[PDB]
Amino acid sequence: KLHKEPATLIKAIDGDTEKLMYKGQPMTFRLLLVDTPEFNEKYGPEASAFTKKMVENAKKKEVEFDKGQRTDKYGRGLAYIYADGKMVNEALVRQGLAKVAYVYKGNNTHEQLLRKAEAQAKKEKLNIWS
Ligand SMILES: Cc1cn([C@H]2C[C@H](OP(=O)(O)O)[C@@H](COP(=O)(O)O)O2)c(=O)[nH]c1=O
Numbered sequence: 001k002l003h004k005e006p007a008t009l010i011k012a013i014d015g016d017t018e019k020l021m022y023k024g025q026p027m028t029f030r031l032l033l034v035d036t037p038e039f040n041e042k043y044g045p046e047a048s049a050f051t052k053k054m055v056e057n058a059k060k061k062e063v064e065f066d067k068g069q070r071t072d073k074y075g076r077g078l079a080y081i082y083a084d085g086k087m088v089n090e091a092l093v094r095q096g097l098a099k100v101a102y103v104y105k106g107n108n109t110h111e112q113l114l115r116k117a118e119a120q121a122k123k124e125k126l127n128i129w130s
Pocket residue numbers: 030031032033034035072073078102107
């Protein structure tokens with residue numbers, strides 16, 4: 001079982017990265033197990049807008065680390081991010097705005113959950129899958 005930790009919004013970045021204050025440190029969090037298009041790729045601006053609004057509209061922001069690496073080689077936090085209890089990683093995938101991606105054995109607690117979301121988005125031919 002993982003645990004959710006409080007964090008506070010600093011600023012949006014793009015569909016799968018967000019800047020949060022965590023334990024008094026400004027950190028870029030990269031979302032586990034997903035990949036949104038880069039900002040100037042198709043669906044890029046939409047995935048950016050979706051993550052940005054989902055986070056900044058939530059009263060309660062939380063980060064949840066997995067069991068393995070907590071930071072990548074760039075110093076970004078690797079986490080599942082929750083906004084009023086809804087997981088952003090999952091919501092992007094469900095809406096066809098991110099693919100399941102960067103799936104590593106240390107750090108794949110929510111893999112089945114996100115794959116179930118992805119299969120729904122592909123069935124519906126949403127966005128990336130249209
Ligand atoms: C999601 C994720 C990305 N990364 C690294 C892999 C890629 O590094 P390399 O470019 O060195 O191969 C990079 C992709 O992030 P972005 O999709 O944000 O560009 O982030 C991890 O190390 N672990 C992860 O869980």
